[PDB]
Enzyme design. Structure first.
Site, PDB file in Angstrom:
ATOM      1  N   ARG A   1     -18.940 -10.758 -13.921  1.00 25.26           N
ATOM      2  CA  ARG A   1     -20.303 -10.398 -13.553  1.00 25.26           C
ATOM      3  C   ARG A   1     -20.343  -9.033 -12.862  1.00 25.26           C
ATOM      4  O   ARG A   1     -19.333  -8.522 -12.369  1.00 25.26           O
ATOM      5  CB  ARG A   1     -20.915 -11.474 -12.656  1.00 25.26           C
TER       6      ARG A   1
ATOM      7  N   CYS B   1       0.813  -1.201   0.000  1.00 21.26           N
ATOM      8  CA  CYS B   1       0.000   0.000   0.000  1.00 21.26           C
ATOM      9  C   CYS B   1       0.855   1.263   0.000  1.00 21.26           C
ATOM     10  O   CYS B   1       1.988   1.279   0.492  1.00 21.26           O
ATOM     11  CB  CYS B   1      -0.955  -0.019   1.183  1.00 21.26           C
TER      12      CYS B   1
END
Ligand SMILES: O=c1[nH]c(=O)c2[nH+]cn([C@@H]3O[C@H](COP(=O)(O)O)[C@@H](O)[C@H]3O)c2[nH]1
Ligand SMILES: O=c1[nH]c(=O)c2[nH+]cn([C@@H]3O[C@H](COP(=O)(O)O)[C@@H](O)[C@H]3O)c2[nH]1
Ligand SMILES: O=c1[nH]c(=O)c2[nH+]cn([C@@H]3O[C@H](COP(=O)(O)O)[C@@H](O)[C@H]3O)c2[nH]1
Ligand SMILES: O=c1[nH]c(=O)c2[nH+]cn([C@@H]3O[C@H](COP(=O)(O)O)[C@@H](O)[C@H]3O)c2[nH]1
Lengths: 380, 380, 380, 380
Positions: free
Chosen positions: B298, B204
């Site tokens: 999806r 990060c």
């Protein structure tokens, strides 16, 4: 001076990599925070960024690009007075709302009261400083930047007082200083904006060659304390390497930051790109480097030659457009203000708190123990 | 805000590499210490480890593997609600006691009251969070993890309060925070478990891009102080590189830790291994990296897009099975508890003492001045 | 010694890279500052620099070059008494005002009352020290340098007292020490100039082999405090890597500095240049290295052989002429005095203030995050 | 445990690279200082050095070599009781005064009351520890070393008390500890010499795998404070990289040091040299590494197997003879005692003072800014 003798080592100083901002209760999302800042009654920016007054950073093309993104450029003074006046005229004639070829809008452009892009210009302390200031003002400059290595000096303060006295309405930026007493000395002669930083620049060797400087978070905080007393503003100039350092500089008291390295190698910085081993680069150099001081094109008066350089000459990888660089910086600023709960820059300056850390804390803050496989747009 | 102005730099922060645990009188051997921890009345772990809710760390296969070793997995939310519900159903249908092909027993499996492997699932703050939570609960999830970058925010706290109000019995994990006030704000709206960590993760860039964070030992200690007042628990999330850091995180007050990097590249993490120059690796990436946020398979609602990334994309060497990795971590935890005289994790949290050290102390702690000729299973 | 036991770790020490000089109000430009320093009533320098008494730094040729630039050279003692006397005679016979081939003037030459270049010479503690001192004085030496590893030792102090008693008017430099008590012990037996530094030298291993030393800024400051009480002076000897370190050493209380490494590899240092892979270098070695102690040419008495070395042998890149090196150092000193508002060295010693910094502050002080494309003359 | 909770981070710790010894007034030359130390009424060394009880450091051949130089070797216990007894018999039968082929004298040999070389032997905590101790004593061992990872443990203390009770006159070394309370617990059951060090060893991973340890200068100082109260002694075990670290360890309170790495790769360490790419090396490995614990030659009872390793396996460059290595270490010790004005080790322990330094001070202490062209015998 037994008092000075016993206090020789009392003062302590912090820089960007020594501190982090503490997260706080937040009611504002990053996209809704306000990045505007009033540097002076007639000079309002929409993002708190000044481009450095350096001959590898800002001429007309950079000043146009950064004003269209909401900041302001400082056209450097390593050129004749006439040349520098014409650079400003180019900025003030440029389109400020939008251009076609298909429709590029500049909805955050920083403009003067007539809808022209803002622009600033550097001047020195020479015999012809009054003439340079006069021709820049006639060109429509929005701020004069008295750019000196040691702003806390009698010669500089006397020259500023004389300028302030002849040109009563121009916005005056003056620097650089790094102490409360230096900031106070400049505000007391009518400076509107004090520029803070002695030695932190990426390309500079002042601290190593002269032994002099102040770690930049402490310099900002000490000078911003004085600016608050005068109701005026400061520019945090130098040493910013990442967007997170901008947030730190503003939270330490800076009203705006000045960038050299983070804007070097952009399309709009002076010069062209050069391909070296299949890779694109641009030149970036200190204004106190040998090459920058050995300028001699058309004639101009330069500041008194320094015996030895106080900057180096280098090259940076090509970065892309100023618009894309500013977009990444602004995203980082907005994220930090959201974490600190700051709806605007006044809250960031006045309310945010820091936590001090060690070198171990710094290593934890960057990516660690990972083989990065693609460069991030804001972590190159 | 003159009070905030004068205290800008008062706070100090420590991370893992700043401290060591002090050895103490010990009556308990490493093999006899108790590694169990009650995170909530209905959620008991046999080893104090949560796998991170990241799309390169935890889907059904990782959640099964780590629950069979005594921990719990957080199935990530970068998938449709139906898909994430089915991942949980896969975990709850999996064998929890043992399997054949010749007899692999899981004597330390963490299970619910019906003998099914424990499983958790991440949710965000979107319009459909209530529906996701509903379908996860119907699937039998044991804990919901409200996973946000800034848990100390009005929007997050309001969403949690509404969830807590509609689903009165589910265990709620919420995060992330890094301050006592942030932990208190979450416990006050009914959070069961507070997840601690802003910026320490291996992958990060939050601290560098936004300028914000708290060194992780201080964050744990500050938040655990509040958890003790409420009689609730915290997860120490991020920045753990070695098994010794787990012991440090728990001794600083963490009831359990959450691991990303140390579980990346295991057989059970999502994706397959890729051979590069005769060496095996797997992908590991921040959930705030460009690739992780550009998911579009999806349809699902995602958290509001952040303007700029706050993680990087990388690759880790193949590590082997989750079972073998957990075995090494547990051996290190047991060794540390034996050195501190801690028969169980409550004694480690409440009684153990640290000593602060410099970078010179850190260099002495690792192997030094030796050419290592074989990698240790717990020191790669 | 329970008092000594409880205070074992009380003292703290600073070196050059721990501190910066704070800029101050300045009425003096760098070109107008005064770099002169009176080391003793009969020994005045025009730049505050002594060349080290080392067999790879100073013989007649270096002593001539540096005195013509305003400093003084210490001819080393790794030679017979007659040889060292003749080196001094070479210096005192050399032209001090200017030479032709077309006109090279030395307007800043440091000279004695007869217009001859200043020169100093090292002596040890051996049976023949009185004879060496006698022949050096007869040769016209301006200062004797009692050069020992541990100046705060009974044997050294007794030898100095005897020398001071037989030769009542010669200027005596003695060292090295690193504490107030060591400086006081030497001034009390009539030393004129105390030389400060235990372990900081570039080529030395004293701190690693014996475990002993004092960080050099603290050593200077502690010893200069005593020099101020006696109205005498100190030389800051060792550890200076950049011109900015000279400014720091003088501001910490040093009246002058002694340089080894920064003068190594100059044309006037002993030996010739050697081309290695198209690059020019010269030898530089500690006087406590094996090669320097294994000297055995004409016969001389050497200091008692140490069992093990306390220096290493190395090579430095060719630097150019002493004149060009001094020009760069002086430019840096003048810049620092201009920043601190010091019109002369007394103001720098007595008035200047420091700020302490971390390793992060040091990284900001050097050039950072830039690919330097040409070496600066004062930043190689 | 609210008291323990609030003091979690109070303690601070120092290691060798954090400190330097301060030079002091000195009346004693290095060649005249006394390096003798009484570890116990029947165990006197002529140099304050124990060789580590490790299977890559000390068997009979090393124990003979180091006792002939004035120290003592600890024969390791990774062998049968009979084998270890025979190693001791080899030491006690060896020539202690001198040998021919032409005349090698050992004038500083450390000997027992019968003129035989001193020798020590490691034992563990197993069911057969009493039998091992009995057979070692019958072989003439001068000290038993109860060698455990965590000496401050009930099981270890109970075993020592039983040993002390059956064998009333043998000198008992026991360790390792790192706190005052751990040292006190061992001295209270009759230990003669406490061995200090948890985690500092070159080859060890205890601090990284378990998270536990104390920086070694603080550990020595804390434990030596207790030894002074009992009138007994301590061995400073681990983390010594240079001769200067030995001086630091003794000045911090150590009566003697134990060396692994600095003796690894000597002719007399177990194993043979192996040529790899024209360079000579030897194996050096932690006793907690996988290879060292997987020993299974003749049968012996080993300490309870640890789940995971706490050391690594490595190789060191060939160093030469033990005699030449000890000569370099002794020269460094003598130099440091001369600088501190210590005529004997009692004065060094009781009177010497330290100064604390930063990482910048450490860089100044080593050679810096020089290309070393030959390795020094005491700086490789
Ligand atoms: O000491 C200096 N010597 C130099 O040669 C030099 N050139 C630029 N500057 C200053 O550095 C700033 C840009 O710094 P960054 O690249 O770190 O943004 C600029 O805005 C200036 O304040 C110099 N400072
Ligand atoms: O600031 C962040 N930007 C990101 O893109 C990101 N991705 C994961 N995480 C957090 O890092 C934790 C894993 O950390 P480790 O790999 O160090 O175990 C995880 O458990 C998360 O808490 C992120 N934090
Ligand atoms: O401990 C030492 N062992 C040595 O072998 C040695 N040789 C030189 N010196 C000292 O170092 C000074 C020069 O230092 P620089 O190269 O850093 O200027 C010189 O001026 C001396 O003070 C030594 N110190
Ligand atoms: O934590 C440990 N794990 C290990 O595997 C190991 N092996 C040796 N030792 C200890 O290290 C000492 C030698 O250290 P040096 O090589 O630094 O002298 C030795 O004297 C021991 O005290 C170990 N410690």
């Amino acid at each position: 001076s037994n008092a000075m003798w016993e206090t020789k080592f009392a003062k302590e100083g912090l820089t960007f990599d020594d501190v982090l901002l503490v997260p706080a209760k937040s009611d504002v999302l990053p996209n809704d925070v306000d990045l505007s800042v009033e540097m002076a009654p007639s000079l309002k920016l929409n993002v708190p960024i000044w481009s450095a007054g350096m001959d590898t950073i800002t001429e007309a093309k950079m000043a146009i690009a950064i004003a269209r993104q909401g900041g302001i450029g400082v056209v450097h003074k390593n050129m004749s007075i006439e040349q520098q006046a014409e650079e400003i005229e180019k900025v003030k004639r440029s389109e400020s709302g939008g251009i076609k070829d298909k429709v590029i809008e500049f909805p955050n452009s920083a403009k003067d009261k007539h809808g022209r892009l803002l622009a600033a210009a550097a001047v020195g302390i020479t015999n012809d400083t009054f003439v340079r200031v006069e021709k820049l003002i006639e060109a429509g400059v929005d701020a004069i930047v008295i750019d000196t290595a040691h702003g806390h000096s009698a010669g500089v303060i006397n020259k500023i007082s004389e300028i302030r006295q002849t040109f009563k309405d121009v916005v005056i930026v003056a620097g650089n200083v790094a102490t409360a007493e230096g900031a106070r000395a400049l505000f007391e002669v009518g400076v509107d904006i004090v520029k803070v930083g002695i030695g932190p620049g990426s390309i500079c060797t002042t601290r190593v060659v002269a032994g002099v400087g102040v770690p930049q978070i402490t310099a900002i905080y000490d000078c911003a304390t004085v600016a608050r007393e005068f109701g005026k503003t400061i520019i945090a100039d130098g040493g910013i390497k990442y967007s997170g350092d901008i947030v730190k500089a503003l939270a330490a008291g800076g009203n705006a930051v000045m960038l050299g390295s983070m804007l070097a190698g952009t399309d709009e910085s002076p010069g062209e790109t050069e391909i070296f081993q299949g890779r694109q680069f641009k030149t970036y150099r200190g204004m106190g480097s040998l090459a920058a001081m050995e300028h001699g094109d058309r004639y101009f008066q330069a500041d008194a030659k320094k015996l030895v350089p106080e900057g180096i000459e280098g090259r940076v990888p090509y970065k892309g457009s100023v618009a894309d660089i500013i977009f990444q910086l602004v995203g980082g600023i907005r994220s930090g203000m959201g974490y600190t709960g700051s709806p605007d820059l006044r809250h960031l300056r006045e309310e945010a708190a820091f936590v001090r850390m060690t070198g171990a804390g710094l290593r934890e803050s960057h990516p660690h123990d990972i083989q990065i496989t693609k460069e991030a747009p804001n972590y190159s």
